Enzyme design. Structure first.
Site, mmCIF file in Angstrom:
data_model
loop_
_atom_site.group_PDB
_atom_site.id
_atom_site.type_symbol
_atom_site.label_atom_id
_atom_site.label_comp_id
_atom_site.label_asym_id
_atom_site.label_seq_id
_atom_site.Cartn_x
_atom_site.Cartn_y
_atom_site.Cartn_z
ATOM 1 N N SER A 42 -4.897 19.035 -5.411
ATOM 2 C CA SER A 42 -4.429 20.011 -4.433
ATOM 3 C C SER A 42 -3.656 21.158 -5.098
ATOM 4 C CB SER A 42 -3.576 19.363 -3.374
ATOM 5 O OG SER A 42 -4.321 18.416 -2.613
ATOM 6 N N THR A 207 2.134 20.118 -5.108
ATOM 7 C CA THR A 207 1.731 18.830 -5.632
ATOM 8 C C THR A 207 0.217 18.660 -5.502
ATOM 9 O OG1 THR A 207 2.069 17.747 -3.558
ATOM 10 C CG2 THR A 207 3.964 17.741 -5.169
HETATM 11 C C1 LIG Z 1 -4.824 17.204 -2.843
HETATM 12 O O1 LIG Z 1 -4.104 16.882 -3.771
HETATM 13 C C2 LIG Z 1 -4.869 16.366 -1.595
HETATM 14 C C3 LIG Z 1 -3.834 16.734 -0.515
HETATM 15 N N1 LIG Z 1 -2.576 17.163 -1.193
HETATM 16 C C4 LIG Z 1 -1.917 16.097 -1.498
HETATM 17 C C5 LIG Z 1 -0.698 16.106 -2.007
HETATM 18 O O2 LIG Z 1 -0.295 17.095 -2.612
HETATM 19 O O3 LIG Z 1 0.045 15.170 -1.779
HETATM 20 C C6 LIG Z 1 -2.810 14.949 -1.085
HETATM 21 S S1 LIG Z 1 -2.447 13.210 -1.390
HETATM 22 C C7 LIG Z 1 -1.219 12.273 -0.439
HETATM 23 C C8 LIG Z 1 -0.348 11.543 -1.440
HETATM 24 N N2 LIG Z 1 -1.282 10.507 -1.916
HETATM 25 C C9 LIG Z 1 -2.291 10.180 -0.877
HETATM 26 C C10 LIG Z 1 -3.753 10.408 -1.277
HETATM 27 O O4 LIG Z 1 -4.588 10.692 -0.414
HETATM 28 N N3 LIG Z 1 -4.083 10.346 -2.629
HETATM 29 C C11 LIG Z 1 -3.498 9.382 -3.558
HETATM 30 C C12 LIG Z 1 -5.424 10.722 -3.070
HETATM 31 C C13 LIG Z 1 -1.891 11.112 0.284
HETATM 32 C C14 LIG Z 1 -3.326 15.503 0.251
HETATM 33 C C15 LIG Z 1 -4.391 14.656 0.925
HETATM 34 C C16 LIG Z 1 -6.258 16.041 -1.021
HETATM 35 C C17 LIG Z 1 -7.186 17.214 -0.929
HETATM 36 O O5 LIG Z 1 -6.861 15.014 -1.792
#
Ligand SMILES: *C(=O)[C@@H]([C@@H]1N=C(C(=O)O)[C@@H](S[C@@H]2CN[C@H](C(=O)N(C)C)C2)[C@@H]1C)[C@@H](C)O
Length: 260
Positions: A42, A207
């Site tokens: 992301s 993040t």
């Molecule tokens: C991109 O990184 C993703 C979206 N942005 C996020 C972030 O910055 O937290 C995610 S992940 C969130 C924390 N971990 C869980 C998860 O789905 N992962 C471990 C893969 C929820 C948010 C979904 C996205 C595009 O994958």
């Protein structure tokens, strides 16, 4: 010695870590695997939001454009666009929700708005980022597979980009101020760069995480003393189902900031 702390952290963590730090005070940088590609996850949304702000420089109504998206546009991870489904959202609100909640519908909508994946890459090219490559839409760009260059940048390129856009002359002042405001209001970053930074500093960050326990965070840090600092930390691990290591990022930040 950052290098040995970093290598030790990395070996103990069983991952690959990529770090770029720029101190815009003196211009010192700390680089670790800074020129190696890593899945950006992301963290791309930073570059996306910047591109939107770039087009808004030509189009004074762009940020105020109301987007009445529909149920079909909603993705698995879209809390803020889901929240606002009934009434729609402006492009500006879409940029904020993308940065501050990493909302995937808001991201995909903004890429459509710019006119496709290639528009983000061409924006990256316009600011002298030669390493940034967006290959798929959210959420397919987070597979983060070994030795897959798709959806990747370098720590150094991303740090240089953040430098130019947030702290440099790549955008006009209204735009770049908006970019730092969006970042400062990020809600996803408490456990990563923020957790390793002095509690009196201000951190603006984006993040990212994905498969292979990929754990990323890019930040501007506003210190109590001197000039702002750019920090980009990328991390990826051996196994597909690795749990993210937010503590590794906070540790890197502790290690890096100690030096300065
Ligand atoms: C991109 O990184 C993703 C979206 N942005 C996020 C972030 O910055 O937290 C995610 S992940 C969130 C924390 N971990 C869980 C998860 O789905 N992962 C471990 C893969 C929820 C948010 C979904 C996205 C595009 O994958």
């Amino acid at each position: 010695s950052v290098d040995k702390q970093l290598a030790e952290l990395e070996r103990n963590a069983n991952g690959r870590l990529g770090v770029a730090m720029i101190n815009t005070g003196n211009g010192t940088k700390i680089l670790y695997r800074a020129a190696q590609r890593f899945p950006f996850c992301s963290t791309f949304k930073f570059m996306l939001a910047a591109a939107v702000l770039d087009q808004s420089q030509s189009q004074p109504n762009l940020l105020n454009k109301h987007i009445n998206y529909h149920e079909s546009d909603l993705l698995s991870y879209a809390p803020i666009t889901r929240k606002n489904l009934a009434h729609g959202m402006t492009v500006s609100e879409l940029c904020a929700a993308t940065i501050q909640y990493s909302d995937n519908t808001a991201a995909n909508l903004l890429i459509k708005e710019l006119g496709g994946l290639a528009a983000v890459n061409q924006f990256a090219r316009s600011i002298g980022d030669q390493m940034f490559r967006l290959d798929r839409w959210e959420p397919d760009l987070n597979t983060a597979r070994p030795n897959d260059p798709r959806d990747t940048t370098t720590p150094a390129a991303m740090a240089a980009s953040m430098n130019k856009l947030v702290l440099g002359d790549a955008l006009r002042p209204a735009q770049r101020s908006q970019l730092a405001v969006w970042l400062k209001g990020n809600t996803t970053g408490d456990a990563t760069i923020r957790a390793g930074a002095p509690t009196d500093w201000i951190v603006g960050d984006k993040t990212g995480s994905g498969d292979y326990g990929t754990t990323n965070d890019i930040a501007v840090l506003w210190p109590t003393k001197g000039a702002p600092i750019v920090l980009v930390v990328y991390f990826t691990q051996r196994e597909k189902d690795a749990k993210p290591r937010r503590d590794v990022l906070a540790s890197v930040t502790k290690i890096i900031l100690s030096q300065i």
